[PDB]
Structure 1
Amino acid sequence: PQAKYRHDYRAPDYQITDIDLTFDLDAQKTVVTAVSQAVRHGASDAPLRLNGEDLKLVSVHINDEPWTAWKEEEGALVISNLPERFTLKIINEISPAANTALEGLYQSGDALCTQCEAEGFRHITYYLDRPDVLARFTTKIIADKIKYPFLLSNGNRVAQGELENGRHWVQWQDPFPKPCYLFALVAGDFDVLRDTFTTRSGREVALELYVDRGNLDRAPWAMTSLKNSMKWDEERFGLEYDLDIYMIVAVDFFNMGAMENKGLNIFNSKYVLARTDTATDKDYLDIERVIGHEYFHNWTGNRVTCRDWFQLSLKEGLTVFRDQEFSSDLGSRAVNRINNVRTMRGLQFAEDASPMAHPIRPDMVIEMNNFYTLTVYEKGAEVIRMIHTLLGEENFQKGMQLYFERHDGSAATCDDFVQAMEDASNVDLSHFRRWYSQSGTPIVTVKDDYNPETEQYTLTISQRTPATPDQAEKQPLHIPFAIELYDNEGKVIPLQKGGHPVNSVLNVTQAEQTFVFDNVYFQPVPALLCEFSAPVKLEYKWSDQQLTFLMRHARNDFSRWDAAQSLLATYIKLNVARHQQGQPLSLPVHVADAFRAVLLDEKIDPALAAEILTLPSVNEMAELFDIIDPIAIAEVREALTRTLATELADELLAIYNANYQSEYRVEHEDIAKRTLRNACLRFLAFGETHLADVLVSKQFHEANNMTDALAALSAAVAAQLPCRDALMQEYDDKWHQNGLVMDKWFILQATSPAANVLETVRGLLQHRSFTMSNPNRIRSLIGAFAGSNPAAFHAEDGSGYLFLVEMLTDLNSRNPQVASRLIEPLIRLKRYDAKRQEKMRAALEQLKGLENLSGDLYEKITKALA
């Protein structure tokens, strides 16, 4: 498989301006006719090269003339001797039912649907499958009426007919030119929830949400979230929907979460269907986030698209930032920021220190589906958020307006977006552009000094980014470094220098730089990198007391949580080194007191308390260490949880009882009380056994929603309580026929701390609700074991690696995209001790010798073995 390079981008030799598609649909053999109006921009002797994969060509005509000047090659139809303008007509066959990879046109249960991003359209017909080619589509679909009474494609329904033999057809027309990755087609039988939204200028938009028959009762929340998304985009960005219908289809067999096809989003039903007894608060909030994200793509993705795939972050960073601002405006900003930062420090940082590290705008790519990554998305969004921090809201919105003004209707690059922000705001972003082309996480070291004679505080800040596997050369970045200085009463000390106020967002642009502040009338406690104002690691020598003081006084809730994380980091590292020497947990009394203070503070927002009482996950704990000891980390997390359960037992039970709510509401204050209550329950599960067992079975049996029941069932598994098997068996008996609900149970099984967890997980491959043909089930059972049970996955006898090797041997042929999500834990081998490295290397050598090794796995395995 061959690498492609961003520096090789060239404008295409041919454009397509319009395409008329006819699908004669059938699950075994679908016939596709594609009539394209084309224009040659390059030399008369450059042929038209169309991408195509697994297509059976039936005919080629140019202006209606059967064409003899063509040939098929590896992945392409190359057509010569073309005039300057012509109609290309292609007829080809494909086979949806054989498509197990779920790319192109495939079968989802009884429905047919598509996935074309990034490069799936070439699995449907020969085309210029690249996002700088934009064309007006019209799509005519012909199918069996009893099996496919709904026939959907992008845009408006412009024609319909009946035929003999029980067939019918529908034609669709989408007036906006689109690159073909945004093409969609859905055929099948659905219940439809219909509603309307009226934009602020008075366009009425029909909203339609297609779900499997019998599922209409799980649809209103997605519909509500959609209207909330459309309203928010109007109020915050000034953006209205641009068409008359908005369709969403929920399908069960989907690889990528959800997809922004113009006017016809396709969603994994995991991000549509919610009922209070099947879905948790976190499901509700993810449904809202993903409905928003795909809706926000309508502008940042669809009206302005990507010139080439290396520009994926242009739409993803910007749309993730938009879905974050959305969730944050509607819910708790601090809680959102906190969870986004946990993802950054615990999952994205690890990727940026792995063999797959890449800049948010990659330079080289073998399989473009490997690059739907935490880096492109989440670090991409941190990059957009730093532009926001540097510009302020008003300038940022002006940049947005300029970007759409210059680029509405075409494919753009990241550099174009930066340039629009720079021109509209007058803030210079040429050094800042380096965040697009450099990978790895910067490390920012802060030293400080307080001068009592001059009342001056001096920060000496330095940065460097260690080399990564992909780039030997690294340079300083333009790092926005926000600070606050606190006096002894907890009040903010005004930042100033030489009689002039100073912006508290410092511009750290050099390897090393000093900043001096005047009129600092008391020795300050600093809050550093506030609101995680750049995605960097902070190295600063805090005292425990500086941290507990920030916990008590910092102005922003994010800083309070974050001071608590640095407080815990020190003791997490101490206790991991202790675990390696055979020693028990050691924690000073004053740290346990700081969390007691949080439990009993009556003014603190419960949402904030809940987050401070949620320990760093094993993945965030892993980023504290050069070499990861996954067993020590897991046992330490447990023991820390037992220690605080013991020390704070009375406080925990009291706060748990005070936050009891008899009504269930999907409302931010209620969610917050419920999160705090279940964070308490989790500790209680780890205290005295008998009481634990009682609290937990009791919550499980009395819960009136899946949030409270799952938190119980989950604490029973984690703490291996006596009632565990009985509760687990009840959930199976009640929920087995429901895949989305069972996913939560597979997750608990996969991440259990029980000694025989691998054995159970292997037995679950045979379970009535598991199947290898469904990505959601594969991820819930196998991916959760490999990626979320690191203690068991990295068992010393290497049984975890062998297991993943068997599964990936199946998946490499069945569904390479899912194979490639699942291999990720094995490609981190260099973070582990020599003996685990050697087995992981052996497992990767084994996969490397597979017969038809997919490009997706090939790219990752060779970077890992390098």
Structure 2
Amino acid sequence: PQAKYRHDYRAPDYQITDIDLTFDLDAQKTVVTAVSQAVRHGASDAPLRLNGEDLKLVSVHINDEPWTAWKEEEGALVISNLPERFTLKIINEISPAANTALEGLYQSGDALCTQCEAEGFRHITYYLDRPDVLARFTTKIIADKIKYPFLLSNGNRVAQGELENGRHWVQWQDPFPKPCYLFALVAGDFDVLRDTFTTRSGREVALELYVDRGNLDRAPWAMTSLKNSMKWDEERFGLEYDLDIYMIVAVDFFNMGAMENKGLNIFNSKYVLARTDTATDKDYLDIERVIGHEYFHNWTGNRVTCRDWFQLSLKEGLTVFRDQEFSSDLGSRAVNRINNVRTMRGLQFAEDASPMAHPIRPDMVIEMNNFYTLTVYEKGAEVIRMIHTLLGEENFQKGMQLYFERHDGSAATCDDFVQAMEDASNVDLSHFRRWYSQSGTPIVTVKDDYNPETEQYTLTISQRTPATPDQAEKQPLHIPFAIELYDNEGKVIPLQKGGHPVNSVLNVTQAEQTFVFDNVYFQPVPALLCEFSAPVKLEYKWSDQQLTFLMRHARNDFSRWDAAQSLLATYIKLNVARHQQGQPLSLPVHVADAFRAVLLDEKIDPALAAEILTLPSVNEMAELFDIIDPIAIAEVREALTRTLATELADELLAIYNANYQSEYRVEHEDIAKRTLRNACLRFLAFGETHLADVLVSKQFHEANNMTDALAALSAAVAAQLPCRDALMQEYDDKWHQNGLVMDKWFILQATSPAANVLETVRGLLQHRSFTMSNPNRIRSLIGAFAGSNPAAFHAEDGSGYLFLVEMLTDLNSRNPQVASRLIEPLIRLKRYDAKRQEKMRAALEQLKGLENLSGDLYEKITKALA
């Protein structure tokens, strides 16, 4: 299993311009006939080297001549002595039924469907499976009519027929040249929700959502979100859809969230199906964002694609930026930003310090499916956001316009995109490019000085990025460092120097620099790194009062939330050290009072209050520490919850009651009120036991929507309340036939604070709603245990590790992509104490020694054991 390197990129020796596919479909044996029009660009004597994996080759012809000058090697069909232009015809067989990895053509229940990204099409036929080869596809699909009455591929229907013996066929053509990773095929029996969207220029688009028979009741929100996405891309980016039909198919068996195949997106049904009794507000907004994301790819990914897979962030950073902007414009910008920042600081920063650390544009890759990462996606988006901060919206949209004008219809690089932005805007991004090539999280240290004699305020700012396992050398970045300065009354002080305004985005470009501001009439309280203006750790010595001041006065809701996080961080760290010495929680009264004030402030947006009243996750808390003590973190989180619930009990109950809503709606104001009310409930669950039990049980039984029901259920679990077992059993009895709804319950089981959680989780491997064959079930029971219950996962006896080894031993052979996401908690070993490291290292060594170790796991294990 050999690494590939970004610096080895070279243009292909051959292009394929047009490919005509025929599939004779059957679950046990599918026959694929692929006719490709090829053109040699390289040297006359260069062979054509086609990728192929797990294919039974039947025949190879070149301009209808059966070919002799070829050989099959590991992963390849190498064809020699070719003309400059020719027709390649390959026939091969594949077996969808055998495909447990869900890569290429496989079964999802009784349907047949595909996943081709990154390198899945080579599991369907021998091809130039690289994204700089763009070809016009036509696809003919032949199958049993009764089993597969819908035969779908990319584009428009151009032919159809019926055959003997109950078989029929449909042929598709997609006029836009595409890399094969955007190829899709679906065959099966579906219900279909049909609607239309008319673009601003008048193009009428047929919209078609394919779902399992009986799920039409759960389709309209996804349809609505598709229309919303299309309207927003027109309004915000000036982009219209480019075809006549937009098909989405919801499948139950899917490794990823969803996939942007041109005109034929395939979605994990988790990101399509919603009804108010099955899906929470969070599920609705996740459906919205994922529908949006895949739609947005139509331009940022499909009309301009990636030259090579090292450029993955070109499409994923930018499309995630777009989906954040969509969510943020339609809903709560603050809540979106807060949550994306929680992901960055609490999950992405952990990756960037891990053995799998990489730059957003990686340099070295063994298995490309391991690089669909928090770094490439979330940090990628923060990098795009920095360009947006640096340029402003108008210049940023100029750069988008120049990027498409230059690269529409082509496969481009990250560097191309930066250059478009630089050239359209006239902002120099030469230094900024280092964000693409350097891994690790910068640490920005800020000191300040106020000089009352000159009425000057000086910020002394320094940066450094620690070495990471992948890179021994680090250099300063171009860090956009947004500030705001507050006077004694909470009014913003104008930034100026030497009689001229100073932009509030400071260009932090050196290891150390000073910024001086004049006409500073009063010693300021600064708001620093406003709206998380760069993806960096900030070191500033905040007083508690400065932070509670920001919580009361800061102009941007994000700053209020961020000040609350810094206030809490001090006391989370305090109490973890106390826990380790056997001492109980200590919290100053004035800290509790700051959160009391948030609860009682009628002018604060309830969306914001809810977030201030949501404590950092155990993952976010881990980032605060040089060495992670997951048991101390978990216990402190609970103790803090309990302490706040006791101190704020009256106020909590008052606000809980005030935000009661008898109507359920999926509307942002309503969602914000529910989030507040349920943030209150979480604390109240940890108050006096009898009142808690009654309140929680009543909300579960009386809820008219899954948001409120699950919030109660989840609090019964979190607080180990008396009603917990009865409510958990009620939910199983009602919902066990519905895997998506049971995922929520598997997550609660996996994240339970109960002493016997591992025993329960193992027992649920045999539950009626669980199956090892379904990625969502795996992720919900097993992934949630390992990733979201680190206290149990990291049980001192090593039992969590042993359990993960067993599961991984199965998944390594069944579904390497799912296995590789699941191993991630084990690769963080060097963050833990020595005895945990020894046990985790022993587990990794066991997996290293597996017969038939997948490349997916091999890459991660080798980095971890280094």
Aligned pairs (5 A) from 1:85-484: 85-484=85-484
Cα offset, 1:848, TM superposition: 0.3
Cα offset, 1:766, TM superposition: 0.3
**Cα distance in 2 between the residues matched to 1:649 and 1:448:** 39
Q: Does 1:36 align with 2:53?
A: no
**Cα distance in 2 between the residues matched to 1:333 and 1:700:** 30
**Cα distance in 2 between the residues matched to 1:75 and 1:117:** 17
Partner of 2:7: 7
**Cα distance in 2 between the residues matched to 1:246 and 1:510:** 48
What do the CA deviations read for 1:699-746 (whole angstroms, capped 9, x no partner)?
000000000000000000000000000000000000000000000000
What do the CA deviations read for 1:141-172 (whole angstroms, capped 9, x no partner)?
00000000000000000000000000000000
What do the CA deviations read for 1:572-620 (whole angstroms, capped 9, x no partner)?
0000000000000000000000000000001110000000000000000
**Cα distance in 2 between the residues matched to 1:20 and 1:602:** 64
SS at match of 2:177: strand
**Cα distance in 2 between the residues matched to 1:181 and 1:768:** 35
Cα offset, 1:208, TM superposition: 0.1
Cα offset, 1:44, TM superposition: 1.1
SS at match of 1:151: strand
**Cα distance in 2 between the residues matched to 1:130 and 1:43:** 19
Cα offset, 1:10, TM superposition: 0.1
Cα offset, 1:458, TM superposition: 0.2
Cα offset, 1:417, TM superposition: 0.1
**Cα distance in 2 between the residues matched to 1:750 and 1:542:** 37
Partner of 1:707: 707
What do the CA deviations read for 1:299-357 (whole angstroms, capped 9, x no partner)?
00000000000000000000000000000000010000000000000000000000000
**Cα distance in 2 between the residues matched to 1:744 and 1:437:** 38
**Cα distance in 1 between the residues matched to 2:549 and 2:787:** 36
Cα offset, 1:286, TM superposition: 0.1
**Cα distance in 1 between the residues matched to 2:355 and 2:619:** 17
**Cα distance in 1 between the residues matched to 2:279 and 2:76:** 45
**Cα distance in 2 between the residues matched to 1:335 and 1:28:** 48
What do the CA deviations read for 1:679-705 (whole angstroms, capped 9, x no partner)?
000000000000000000000000000
Partner of 1:665: 665
Which structure 2 segments of 5+ residues have no match?
Answer: none
**Cα distance in 2 between the residues matched to 1:140 and 1:793:** 49
**Cα distance in 1 between the residues matched to 2:668 and 2:145:** 45
Q: Report percent identity of matched pairs.
A: 100
SS at match of 2:117: coil
What do the CA deviations read for 1:231-290 (whole angstroms, capped 9, x no partner)?
000000000000000000000000011000000000000000000000000000000000
SS at match of 1:462: strand
**Cα distance in 2 between the residues matched to 1:611 and 1:761:** 30
**Cα distance in 1 between the residues matched to 2:335 and 2:759:** 37
SS at match of 2:175: strand
Cα offset, 1:402, TM superposition: 0.2
SS at match of 1:178: coil
**Cα distance in 1 between the residues matched to 2:416 and 2:392:** 19
SS at match of 1:453: coil
**Cα distance in 2 between the residues matched to 1:114 and 1:602:** 51
Partner of 1:559: 559
**Cα distance in 1 between the residues matched to 2:392 and 2:745:** 44
Cα offset, 1:842, TM superposition: 0.2
What do the CA deviations read for 1:357-385 (whole angstroms, capped 9, x no partner)?
00000000000000000000000000000
What do the CA deviations read for 1:201-226 (whole angstroms, capped 9, x no partner)?
00000000000000000000000000
**Cα distance in 2 between the residues matched to 1:206 and 1:396:** 31
What do the CA deviations read for 1:155-205 (whole angstroms, capped 9, x no partner)?
000000000000000000000000000000000000000000000000000
What do the CA deviations read for 1:105-158 (whole angstroms, capped 9, x no partner)?
000000000000000000000000000000000000000000000000000000
SS at match of 2:17: strand
Cα offset, 1:454, TM superposition: 0.1
SS at match of 2:471: coil
What do the CA deviations read for 1:656-697 (whole angstroms, capped 9, x no partner)?
000000000000000000000000000000000000000000
Cα offset, 1:62, TM superposition: 0.1
**Cα distance in 1 between the residues matched to 2:769 and 2:77:** 43
**Cα distance in 2 between the residues matched to 1:42 and 1:391:** 40
**Cα distance in 1 between the residues matched to 2:136 and 2:256:** 25
Runs of 4+ in 1 over 4 A off after TM superposition: none
Cα offset, 1:48, TM superposition: 0.1
**Cα distance in 2 between the residues matched to 1:17 and 1:790:** 50
**Cα distance in 2 between the residues matched to 1:603 and 1:406:** 48
SS at match of 1:742: helix
**Cα distance in 1 between the residues matched to 2:602 and 2:823:** 46
**Cα distance in 2 between the residues matched to 1:251 and 1:95:** 19
What do the CA deviations read for 1:455-502 (whole angstroms, capped 9, x no partner)?
000000000000000000000000000000000000000000000000
**Cα distance in 1 between the residues matched to 2:807 and 2:337:** 36
What do the CA deviations read for 1:724-775 (whole angstroms, capped 9, x no partner)?
0000000000000000000000000000000000000000000000000000
**Cα distance in 2 between the residues matched to 1:530 and 1:671:** 26
**Cα distance in 1 between the residues matched to 2:739 and 2:796:** 33
**Cα distance in 2 between the residues matched to 1:704 and 1:416:** 51
**Cα distance in 2 between the residues matched to 1:271 and 1:113:** 17
What do the CA deviations read for 1:391-449 (whole angstroms, capped 9, x no partner)?
00000000000000000000000000000000000000000000000000000000000
Partner of 1:852: 852
SS at match of 2:298: coil
**Cα distance in 1 between the residues matched to 2:287 and 2:232:** 16
Cα offset, 1:796, TM superposition: 0.2
Q: TM-score, normalised by structure 2?
A: 1.00
**Cα distance in 1 between the residues matched to 2:283 and 2:651:** 29
**Cα distance in 2 between the residues matched to 1:255 and 1:244:** 28
SS at match of 1:177: coil
**Cα distance in 2 between the residues matched to 1:59 and 1:591:** 74
**Cα distance in 1 between the residues matched to 2:330 and 2:79:** 53
**Cα distance in 1 between the residues matched to 2:188 and 2:134:** 28
Aligned pairs (5 A) from 1:37-52: 37-52=37-52
What do the CA deviations read for 1:496-527 (whole angstroms, capped 9, x no partner)?
00000000000000000000000000000000
Which structure 1 segments of 5+ residues have no match?
Answer: none
Q: Does 1:538 align with 2:534?
A: no
Cα offset, 1:561, TM superposition: 0.3
Cα offset, 1:59, TM superposition: 0.1
**Cα distance in 2 between the residues matched to 1:42 and 1:417:** 27
Q: Does 1:74 align with 2:74?
A: yes
**Cα distance in 1 between the residues matched to 2:41 and 2:218:** 50
**Cα distance in 1 between the residues matched to 2:645 and 2:43:** 74
Q: How many residues are matched? A: 866
**Cα distance in 2 between the residues matched to 1:411 and 1:533:** 30
**Cα distance in 1 between the residues matched to 2:603 and 2:132:** 54
SS at match of 1:176: coil
What do the CA deviations read for 1:773-819 (whole angstroms, capped 9, x no partner)?
00000000000000000000000000000000000000000000000
Cα offset, 1:647, TM superposition: 0.1
**Cα distance in 2 between the residues matched to 1:314 and 1:603:** 41
**Cα distance in 2 between the residues matched to 1:301 and 1:459:** 41
**Cα distance in 2 between the residues matched to 1:565 and 1:376:** 25
**Cα distance in 2 between the residues matched to 1:634 and 1:854:** 34
Cα offset, 1:630, TM superposition: 0.1
